[PDB]
Ligand binder design. Structure first.
Ligand code: CDL
Ligand code: CDL
Ligand code: 3PE
Ligand code: 3PE
Ligand code: 3PE
Ligand code: 3PE
Ligand code: 3PE
Ligand code: PLC
Lengths: 161, 95, 141, 192, 506, 105, 80, 78, 183
């Protein structure tokens, strides 16, 4: 019983009914959490933790910006919607969940055959660091160049003087 | 966006409706209708009408204007010249 | 590496948190057993906000100026810098001297932004009010 | 197309600087003093403020010289690089390069020199640094490693050219020269 | 040279005291840096050596003769732009001090120049995403450099959101290609050009089409260019098109290997709509920068017809058109900044508000320029007649070469439409000329002691004081005569375009 | 030549060999056109997605359905729960059907 | 349900809600990259995935700063 | 793995706050789980209808191609 | 490295549930044209204890099998079946000898490894007794290639890293050999 379906259905229901900005940043948290958990199992545990390390810090900075901008607008603005139409919209979106139309690729399972040739076994993060600092060191240096531009960019935009 | 959308006829029409909710002497109100004589308003009755007119158009008469206004037409002229829409939040305009 | 034991712990932790709330909801005596002031949803004098005794203006959705907003924004580029050091942590030996130099040059670029922040004084707390002494001068004729 | 002999497709940083001609230092010096001169020239063309000439402050002159110092060196570095690539007349550089390589070969030493980088890193470093001088105007990147991917054959250093008979250099076979790929994989084919 | 000198300028600017004079002198330092960068690039990069194409930095970047020409153009046009902020444009402190107020002006420009030059050189989908964001972020910062301006910050907010969506589309296209093939290097992808979904590259072009204001995504570009200051609009409306169009030509060069007819029709459909909006859009407008934004959209459509054809004549057409349009773009905005000194001073109906950021904001503010400055008015007239396409100006040959590539490749519908669009756009082009000169004979016997230039004090009443500074006037004079006298050296310049090869060889 | 298809341990993965043979064929001077390398390109794409092999499995399953063959009679035995990879299923001589320990290795 | 542009309703009616939408959209591309890289056993795709996370974080900081200054300008009299 | 611990709390708090809204979502979730678990084939039919109406190669379309080939190959042999 | 794959057992059953993993068995043996071989029956701990003894005894067969793989040009699994069976029999012979000549010393070593996280540094006392017994009865010596003979870590007198908890059986056996063998 894939419980990931139920969690996404609940998340999608609140996306259509979210009114204030606080409910929107809560939607973002309710989006990263299914991504991290579904990454923690199945595909990649490494990037599930990397998503938590980086995006959670961004969420707090996002949240503290909301406290400086909320201006009573959505605390009294009315919304109409309707319970019946919201469920109908979510039901129709539930009907089609096939992102690809290659039936053979989606219905036939495959296996891999492991080999003992790799006596030197290390984590994927070490291999990423091996290539990032040697093969693609230019990308790493340009990324630091972009980070430098952001630091200068933030100061000039925000600082009054 | 932030600009007046009033007209002399609409302002006069709503000014008459507000003034007809009081115990004025005459229901025939035009630009030249005076508060003191035609409407029979005293000191406090006139100030009640002025504040009531403030609530309708979301404007605030200054002290000098309110202490010297005589006719309804002067009220209409003040509303046209000074009315502005209230500034909205950042989300209302750019979204 | 088997993580079935870990999964059971995570399940228990989630259930454990609900036990604390469930116990508190089922242990407290009913309002009728207490002074019987009714449900909390009606006791508005209790469910209202706390303002040290005196009620004040209700500013729940008013804007809140933040004097460290630039420090908050500068956190994100520096957080990415620290995160980008993770690949070098577990690959320090394999990259050898070449990766060490690349890792130093990576930090030598971000140190320019660190120097820029030091000179621009962008880390200081911003204040609306300023305290300046005024020299008293006499316009003698 | 004016083409000359290829010396080194990825010359080392020290090799490029050593092979500087007297004109290369001359262009380096002109770049160093040109940038302060341009600030003087710009003020003469149109003063920064007012209508009369005003010398730029010494603080501007100091930073302008530093900018010109790196600008002049980069220009000189590019000019010397083309001689290794063969895009420019390099008969002086060919003769000097051949003498150094033959001397290293006679000593059973690699002309490229010993390296701290393993076989993968030496190849990786060459890929990053090769032809990087084409973007030297955008951002710097230099060959500061002793790799073996220089786009030349050491066999061409065995043939004797004019003016080299008196060098009296004896050249052993390449398989007996240390720190060469053809003389490392003796026991294992995957380990040097 | 750029990267090393940028770091020195960043540290130096934060150390010295905050003043308008130091900022202007630092701007001149940035001018020297770009000039030194041009000299270094010309010393090592030649057209003949780069004809084959040379890989760099583990094949992440690939430079050829086609790419090298645009890089040289980018450096040259950036030099002419820095002259605006490195020297006086009007000679008046109340007007010129805006350019000297922000110290990070020269720093942000140097950041963007690095992005602009490297973008056509990208040879990997990973570095493509990195560089396109490096260029995009620098444009957002420059749009928001005047953080005390409500319109500047609003435009940057609009620019950030639209560009971020385009970046997502670009990232989504590259990720989809990686999923199909598993490769990130473009040359490796070219091995499977016949086995990957070629419409995924159309998704990549859609993201690039947004960043150049192509229809139907034109609306944000017109709004941003009109609200942004004239000194900022002059840069952000031209520089992104120099690099992205060059990259689009390379991508379309790879797409034409499989020659997907459906791909061409979709791009033709967008070009057709852009010519309609570009021509009819500017007919009813009152702002000069709004008019130029529609003019920018129309001219990009003309270049895209050459790009879509992607033949030998297209290389000649695109290289010539992009060079001459940039010179015309600089000349027009240079004149607009200068002529602000002839604005009358009030001493009111319509309650017109003019700010220091955009002193020239309406087309009718150019009235009586024929009387105020006859040489500047003719220089503007030559530039406008070039945009129209009147021969033998530079603009005619640009449209002449574009028509050659379009009709040779069978784009009969687009060629006829582009000529109808040219005639429609001539209406609003002629309106600028009408405002300048059509009332000269009635206002010749008029008195104007209330102009902005009249507020400038005299030195000694005997010095012949020029109304315009030496540098900006000389640039206008040089660019105007190059546009006018292109027939003298037209044959040799096209011969230079003959030698610009994109893997043609033989 | 940049590295592509690198395994999780720094070496070539399963499909690098297919990719390497494609590059060698395309960059070989003896070839006049890229037609001889077409078969090598299909193998590399088959290595990653196995789309043709999955299609072959689709036909075999569909063909057996019309013949009335039971899937459990011509298929391969499988276990869905890792804790039930018992020693009886593994065929051990004294194999029991009690569940195996998979909590902590 | 996607072709009728249903996602335009799921996005809230605030400027910061547009920012959240962009972060989710970019995050979807990164998840897809991790999905392809993990199946292929390709660390190059994981290098791409890490770059996309770092670059997207830079984009959020720049956009927030513009939005912070935009909100500052309206409440900038500060006469008190 | 954080959703594992969070899921009991959010689900309980969902029904406590919106019991009817949560019931419809949970009921819809369970219905499509029963359809897939009991092999009722409701979702498969919708997927087949979508592929047929949008021009996609369908399960029956792929099988018909095999039948045409099989008929052709058999005729060639005989 | 605990990265999830499609080639072996993953970290938890939740990964199996998301992947819908089927643990598939095959009931068919190798075809009769391929000669049958006796598979090695040693588990992880005995194999790690005898790793250097298999290498010393079967070095030429290990190299020949691996040289067959490289020279097969992608057809390694099929072509090198003959070379594979030589390694399996040679490796089995080493384990058979260890169970007939050094069973007490062999079992003491790999039971220490099971007691100490299968780390070589934590079972030096048991390994030294095993190494001495194998040399005196099989003429096989543990050797670590690429380093000088005296700089081998297993022969180091005072290692920096030592086991936290002593193995009592190893301690008793080591003392029984110190006093008796070295009088
Ligand atoms: C050392 C001091 C120095 O050289 O800079 C002078 C400068 C003098 O400071 P000051 O006395 O307060 O300035 C007073 C006047 O404004 C000083 O006015 P000024 O005009 O004399 O200084 C401006 C300076 C411009 O300053 C720079 O460009 C320095 C940039 C370095 C990055 O231009 C120059 O003076 C040119 C010569 C000095 C710079 C040469 C650097 C070569 C590149 C390496 O010191 C710095 O700039 C400090 C920045 C570096 C701090 C240390 C960072 C170390 C990072 C690595 C640590 C790990 C190893
Ligand atoms: C958008 C932004 C984009 C990003 C931009 C950010 C910037 C990135 C580019 C940065 C520069 C590219 C480097 C990237 C990382 C490379 C790392 C690497 O390969 O290290 C391997 C390298 C080991 O490789 P190797 O094969 O053993 O070669 C040993 C020597 O490098 C080779 O021995 P040698 O024969 O060349 O001479 C050894 C000795 C000199 O002793 C001699 O005998 C030379 C005789 C002639 C003297 C001529 C003087 C020329 C220098 C003036 O010292 C040297 O001259 C080394 C040459 C480097 C000089 C300083 C570098 C200036 C660069 C500015 O590790 C090092 O220790 C390199 C030392 C150089 C200093 C660090 C270089 C970066 C600064
Ligand atoms: C983790 C255990 C402890 C937390 C359990 C709390 C359960 C509440 C629902 C959790 C979020 C599920 C997904 C919904 C997205 C966010 C929508 C939201 O705004 O919160 C729902 C909450 C319900 O109250 P309601 O009145 O119905 O909504 C307002 C109607 N105008 O309306 C509210 O605004 C109240 C918000 C309270 C603070 C919630 C902050 C977000 C919590 C996220 C943590 C869990 C991560 C997501 C897990 C489920 C993913 C689908
Ligand atoms: C070493 C780095 C600093 C250079 C020091 C030499 C120098 O700058 O000379 C000082 C002179 C400034 O003159 P001034 O300030 O009037 O003298 C002090 C008056 N109390 O400076 C000047 O007159 C400006 C002329 C250029 C000064 C040298 C600039 C190059 C600095 C070294 C660059 C190395 C790279
Ligand atoms: C500043 C003008 C400097 C002109 C330098 C032109 C240039 O970059 O070289 C030509 C370039 C091709 O050069 P290439 O083939 O690689 O090498 C051979 C060079 N002899 O070809 C090019 O790509 C250049 C394309 C741009 C052409 C620009 C033409 C000049 C623009 C007008 C200059 C106005 C000068 C104003 C002066 C202001 C100061 C008072
Ligand atoms: C002998 C020399 C000949 C030289 C000229 C040759 C061309 C002649 C063209 C003839 C057609 C235009 C002349 C007649 C149009 C009159 C327009 C008009 O009367 O009103 C506009 C009309 C709406 O009507 P309304 O605004 O209510 O006016 C009151 C009418 N009783 O609005 C409409 O309904 C018009 C239809 C909607 C707009 C359609 C636009 C689609 C494209 C039209 C073609 C443009 C092609 C441009 C190609 C380059 C750009 C791509
Ligand atoms: C289980 C239910 C699942 C339902 C999934 C779809 C949800 C509802 C969406 C409405 C369907 C429209 C989209 C259909 C797919 C896109 C069109 C397409 O690709 O063609 C498919 C359809 C049949 O294709 P067919 O020829 O039979 O087979 C292909 C052979 N090569 O060819 C068609 O004729 C489809 C209809 C397309 C023509 C009408 C739409 C275009 C004209 C109106 C445009 C309105 C919007 C304009 C927006 C323009 C923006 C630039
Ligand atoms: C661990 C600590 C153990 C000691 C404290 C236990 C308190 C719970 C017992 C209780 O509440 O018993 C009294 C109750 C009812 O009486 P009430 O006060 O109205 O219940 C109020 C509590 N609700 C909210 C659960 C109704 O009786 C019963 O039938 C309990 C069933």
């Amino acid at each position: 019983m894939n419980l990931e379906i139920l969690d996404l259905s609940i998340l999608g229901f609140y996306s259509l009914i979210s009114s204030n900005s606080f409910e929107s940043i809560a939607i973002l948290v309710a989006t990263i959490m299914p991504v991290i958990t579904e990454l923690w199992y199945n595909y990649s545990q490494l990037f599930a933790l990397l998503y938590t390390l980086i995006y959670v810090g961004a969420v707090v900075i996002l949240f503290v910006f909301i406290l400086s901008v909320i201006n009573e607008k959505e605390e009294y603005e009315y919304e109409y919607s309707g319970l019946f139409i919201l469920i109908l919209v979510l039901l129709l979106d539930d009907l089609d969940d096939n992102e690809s139309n290659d039936n053979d690729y989606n219905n036939v399972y495959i296996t891999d055959y492991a080999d003992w040739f790799n006596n030197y076994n290390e984590s994927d993060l070490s291999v990423i660091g091996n290539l990032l600092f040697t093969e693609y060191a230019l990308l790493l240096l340009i990324i630091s160049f972009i980070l430098l531009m952001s630091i200068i960019g933030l100061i000039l935009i925000v600082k009054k003087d | 966006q932030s600009a007046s959308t009033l007209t002399k006829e609409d302002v006069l029409t709503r000014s008459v409706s507000v003034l007809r909710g009081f115990e004025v002497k005459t229901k025939d109100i035009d630009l030249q209708t005076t508060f003191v004589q035609d409407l029979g308003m005293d000191s406090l009755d006139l100030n009640d009408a002025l504040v009531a007119l403030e609530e309708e158009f979301d404007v605030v008469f200054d002290d000098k204007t309110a202490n010297e206004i005589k006719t309804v037409g002067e009220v209409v002229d003040f509303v046209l010249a000074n009315y502005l829409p209230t500034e909205q939040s950042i989300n209302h305009t750019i979204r | 590496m088997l993580q079935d034991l870990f999964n059971n712990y995570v399940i228990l932790v989630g259930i454990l948190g609900l036990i604390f709330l469930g116990v508190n909801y089922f242990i407290v005596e009913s309002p009728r057993m207490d002074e019987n002031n009714g449900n909390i949803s009606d006791y508005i004098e209790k469910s209202g906000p706390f303002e040290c005794g005196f009620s004040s203006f209700e500013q729940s959705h008013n804007p809140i100026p933040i004097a460290f907003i630039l420090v908050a924004l500068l956190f994100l580029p520096f957080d990415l810098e620290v995160s980008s050091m993770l690949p070098y942590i577990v690959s320090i030996y394999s990259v050898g001297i070449y990766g060490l130099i690349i890792f130093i040059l990576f930090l030598l670029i971000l140190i320019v932004g660190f120097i820029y922040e030091f000179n621009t004084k962008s880390l200081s707390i911003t204040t609306i009010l300023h305290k300046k002494n005024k020299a008293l001068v006499k316009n003698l004729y | 197309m004016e083409t000359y002999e290829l010396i080194d497709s990825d010359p080392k940083f020290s090799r490029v600087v050593r092979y500087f001609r007297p004109s290369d230092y001359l262009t380096w010096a002109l770049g160093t003093i040109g940038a302060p001169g341009l600030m003087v020239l710009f003020e003469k063309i149109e003063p920064a403020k007012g209508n009369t000439f005003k010398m730029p402050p010494p603080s501007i002159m100091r930073i302008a010289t530093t900018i010109g110092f790196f600008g002049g060196f980069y220009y000189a570095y590019t000019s010397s690089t083309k001689r290794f690539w063969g895009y420019s007349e390099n008969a002086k550089e060919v003769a000097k390069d051949r003498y150094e390589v033959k001397k290293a070969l006679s000593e059973k030493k690699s002309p490229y020199g010993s390296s701290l980088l393993n076989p993968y890193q030496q190849d990786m470093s060459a890929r990053n640094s090769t032809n990087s001088q084409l973007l030297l105007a955008i951002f710097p990147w230099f060959n500061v490693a002793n790799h073996q991917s220089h786009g030349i054959d050491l066999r061409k250093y065995y043939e004797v050219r004019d003016g080299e008979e008196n060098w009296n250099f004896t050249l052993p076979p390449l398989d007996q020269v240390k720190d060469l790929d053809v003389a490392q994989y003796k026991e294992y084919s995957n380990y040097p | 040279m750029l990267f090393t000198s940028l770091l020195l300028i960043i540290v130096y600017g934060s150390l010295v005291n905050k003043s308008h004079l130091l900022t202007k002198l630092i701007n001149r330092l940035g001018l020297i840096i770009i000039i030194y960068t041009l000299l270094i690039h010309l010393n090592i990069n030649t057209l003949e050596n780069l004809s084959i194409g040379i890989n760099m930095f583990n094949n992440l970047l690939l430079i050829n003769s086609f790419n090298n020409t645009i890089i040289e153009l980018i450096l040259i046009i950036c030099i002419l732009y820095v002259l605006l902020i490195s020297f006086n444009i009007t000679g008046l402190s109340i007007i010129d001090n805006l350019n000297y107020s922000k110290r990070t002006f020269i720093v942000i420009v140097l950041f963007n120049i690095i992005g602009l030059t490297l973008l056509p050189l990208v040879n990997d989908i990973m570095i493509l995403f990195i560089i396109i964001e490096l260029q995009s972020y620098s444009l957002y910062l420059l749009t928001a450099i005047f953080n005390e301006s409500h319109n500047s910050t609003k435009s940057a907010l609009y620019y950030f959101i639209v560009g971020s969506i385009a970046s997502f589309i670009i990232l989504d296209a590259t990720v989809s290609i990686y999923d199909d093939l598993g490769l990130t290097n473009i040359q490796y992808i070219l091995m499977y050009i016949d086995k990957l979904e070629i419409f995924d590259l159309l998704c990549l072009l859609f993201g690039l089409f947004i960043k150049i204001g192509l229809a139907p995504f034109y609306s944000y570009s017109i709004t941003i260019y009109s609200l942004s200051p004239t000194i900022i609009t002059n840069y952000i409306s031209l520089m992104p098109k120099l690099s992205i169009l060059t990259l689009i030509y390379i991508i379309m060069h790879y797409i034409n290997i499989v020659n997907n007819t459906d791909l061409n029709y979709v791009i033709s459909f967008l070009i057709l709509i852009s010519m309609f909006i570009g021509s009819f859009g500017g007919l009813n407008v009152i702002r000069i920068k709004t008019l130029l934004a529609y003019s920018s959209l129309l001219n990009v459509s003309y270049m895209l017809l050459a790009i879509l054809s992607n033949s030998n004549e297209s290389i000649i057409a695109y290289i010539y058109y992009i060079i001459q349009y940039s010179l015309t773009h600089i000349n027009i905005f240079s004149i607009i900044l200068v002529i602000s000194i002839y604005l009358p001073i009030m001493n009111n109906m319509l309650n017109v508000m003019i700010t220091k950021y955009s002193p020239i904001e309406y087309i009718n503010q150019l009235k009586n320029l024929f009387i105020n400055n006859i040489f500047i008015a003719i220089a503007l007239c030559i530039s406008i007649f070039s945009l129209i396409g009147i021969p033998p100006l530079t603009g005619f040959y640009g449209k002449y070469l574009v028509l050659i590539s379009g009709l040779n490749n069978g784009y009969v519908l687009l060629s006829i439409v582009l000529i109808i669009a040219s005639s429609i756009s001539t209406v609003y082009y002629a309106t600028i000329l009408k405002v300048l000169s059509f009332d000269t004979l009635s206002f010749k016997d008029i008195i104007s002691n209330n102009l902005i230039i009249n507020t400038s004090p005299e030195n000694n009443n005997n010095e012949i004081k020029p109304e315009i500074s030496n540098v900006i006037s000389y640039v206008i004079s040089s660019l105007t005569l190059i546009i006018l006298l292109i027939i003298i050296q037209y044959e040799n310049i096209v011969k230079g375009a003959y030698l610009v090869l994109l893997y043609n060889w033989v | 030549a940049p590295l592509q298809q690198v395994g999780r341990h720094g070496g070539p993965n399963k499909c690098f060999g297919e990719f390497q043979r494609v590059v060698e064929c395309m960059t070989n001077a003896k070839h006049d056109s890229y037609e001889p390398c077409n078969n090598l390109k299909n193998d590399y794409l088959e290595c990653r997605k196995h789309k043709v092999e999955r299609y072959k499995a689709f036909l075999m399953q569909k063909h057996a359905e019309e013949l009335g063959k039971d899937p459990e009679e011509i298929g391969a035995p499988f276990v869905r729960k890792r804790r039930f990879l018992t020693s009886k299923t593994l065929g051990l001589v004294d194999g029991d059907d009690y569940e195996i320990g998979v909590e902590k290795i | 349900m996607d072709l009728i542009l249903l996602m335009l309703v799921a996005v809230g009616l605030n400027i910061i809600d547009i920012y959240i939408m962009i972060e989710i959209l970019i995050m979807g591309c990164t998840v897809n990259t991790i999905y392809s890289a993990s199946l292929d056993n390709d660390m190059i795709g994981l290098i791409y995935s890490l770059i996309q996370i770092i670059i997207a974080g830079v984009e959020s900081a720049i956009g927030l700063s513009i939005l912070v200054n935009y909100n500052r300008i309206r409440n900038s009299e500060e006469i008190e | 793995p954080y959703l594992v611990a969070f899921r009991p709390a959010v689900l309980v708090f969902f029904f406590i706050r919106q019991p009817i809204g949560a019931g419809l979502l949970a009921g819809g979730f369970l219905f499509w789980q029963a359809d897939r678990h009991f092999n009722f084939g409701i979702r498969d039919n919708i997927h087949n209808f979508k592929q047929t109406i949008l021009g996609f190669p369908t399960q029956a379309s792929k099988w018909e191609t095999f039948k045409q080939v099989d008929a052709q190959k058999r005729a060639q042999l005989v | 490295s605990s990265t999830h794959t499609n080639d072996s057992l993953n970290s938890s059953n939740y990964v199996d549930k998301l992947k819908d993993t089927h643990f598939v068995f095959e009931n068919d043996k190798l075809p009769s044209e391929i000669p049958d071989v006796e598979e090695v029956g040693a588990t992880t701990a005995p194999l790690l204890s005898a790793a250097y003894f298999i290498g010393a005894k079967c070095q030429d067969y290990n190299d020949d099998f691996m040289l067959c793989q490289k020279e097969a040009k992608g057809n390694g699994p099929i072509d090198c079946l003959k070379e594979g069976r030589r390694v399996t029999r040679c490796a089995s012979g080493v384990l058979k000898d260890l169970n007939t000549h050094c069973s007490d010393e062999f079992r003491l070593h790999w039971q220490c490894l099971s007691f100490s996280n299968l780390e070589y540094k934590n079972c030096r006392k048991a390994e030294s007794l095993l190494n001495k017994c194998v040399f005196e009865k099989m003429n096989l010596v543990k050797k670590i290639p690429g380093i000088p003979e005296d700089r081998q870590i297993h022969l180091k007198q005072n290692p920096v890293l030592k086991p936290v908890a002593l193995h009592q059986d190893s301690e008793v056996a080591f003392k029984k050999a110190q006093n008796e063998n070295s009088i």
